[PDB]
Structure 1
């Protein structure tokens, strides 16, 4: 395989690691054990259809971390869920929720430190709260005022929005409604959402809501 190797700038500073990501292309140098040597961690994300790349990377010492499915739904606005835009006072509780809900991610041990995944997703949801009109965390509340669920959303382009994080036991359907509402308000035609291949509950929920598969991928690390 031929591939460039690029430092993961944000993750390196955030995790305190010396990691890089491989980008497979015809025009890059040969990917060799020597090119891979000066890194504490190397990541690669390949199309699940590309078995040629899977075995080239495995032969270089990479291992499967997880599969990813990316899906898309037409928008299609719907029942106002009553969700509200998260405010700065919600950050402590959302960080606590997100670090727990997304504890088992591609940043799991033994690839990263035990606290890495929790930190990463807590930062993600905080970043969405401190976002912009086009990057927000929306919250559904119970009648008590407690957070029942949350969904983070971002504009991708003129037609598309993407769900970042979505979590809330028993609130999947209303969180999807919330996301569809948000995309529609911004004139988007398409809503995208990726999940882990192992997350059959999320896959089922998304497909029930009208989603279909756009792409599938493997994350591999060395």
Structure 2
């Protein structure tokens, strides 16, 4: 296996770690134990179909962290769910929800500090509200005015949008409708969303809403 090793600059500043990511290409230097050695953490993402790469990376000391499924949904005029655009005043509530809901990502212990995953996704949802990572966060409210669901969205290109984060017990159908309507309004044909392999509730909901699988992957760390 040949691959470049490059620092994950953003994550390093955010987590306070010395981490890099492997990028497998024909032209890169040989991937060797010596090259990998000084890094506190190294990450690799590979297609789940590529058993050659899996074996090669396991023979360089990498372990499975999690599998990922990336799905796509056709976008049509589904009509709105009554969702509203999150405002700056919703940030504390959303950060709290997200930190609780996304504690078990690929930034989980023992790979990262116990609080790292919650911090990462609290920041993600805040950035969505502010429009600096995702473009918007959309919210559903209960009768009491409390948030019962949210979904963050961004435009990817001329044809595609992507769900960043999505959460809300019993609100899955409505949140998918919300995300598809947002994409439709922006002239997209395709709405993309990825989830962990283990997240059967999410997979089921995406498929119920019209998704099909586009790619599958493993994240492996050293």
DSSP 3-state at the match of 2:149: strand
Question: Per-residue displacement from partner, 1:89-132 (whole Å, max 9, x unpaired)?
Answer: 00000000000101111000000000000000000000000007
Equivalence for 1:80: 80
Unpaired stretches in structure 2, ≥5 consecutive residues? none
- Displacement of 1:143 after TM fit? 1.5
- Matched residue pairs, number? 222
Task: Give the TM-score taking structure 1 as reference length.
Answer: 0.98
Question: Per-residue displacement from partner, 1:37-74 (whole Å, max 9, x unpaired)?
Answer: 12100000000000000010001100000000000000
- Please tell me whether the aligned partners of residues 67 and 219 of structure 2 are also in contact (alpha carbons under 8 angstroms): yes
Unpaired stretches in structure 1, ≥5 consecutive residues? none
Whole-angstrom CA distance in 2 between matches of 1:168 and 1:69: 20
- Displacement of 1:77 after TM fit? 2.1
Task: Give the TM-score taking structure 2 as reference length.
Answer: 0.98
DSSP 3-state at the match of 1:150: strand
DSSP 3-state at the match of 2:153: strand
- Please tell me whether the aligned partners of residues 99 and 119 of structure 1 are also in contact (alpha carbons under 8 angstroms): yes
- Please tell me whether the aligned partners of residues 127 and 134 of structure 2 are also in contact (alpha carbons under 8 angstroms): no
Root-mean-square deviation (CA), in Å?
A: 1.1
Equivalence for 2:168: 168
- Displacement of 1:133 after TM fit? 11
Equivalence for 1:131: 131
Change in CA separation of 1:217 and 1:15 when aligned onto 2, cut-off 3 Å: same
- Return 133-142 or 103-112, whichever deviates more: 133-142
- Please tell me whether the aligned partners of residues 77 and 177 of structure 1 are also in contact (alpha carbons under 8 angstroms): no
Equivalence for 1:154: 154
* Residue 144 of structure 2 corresponds to residue 144 of structure 1: yes
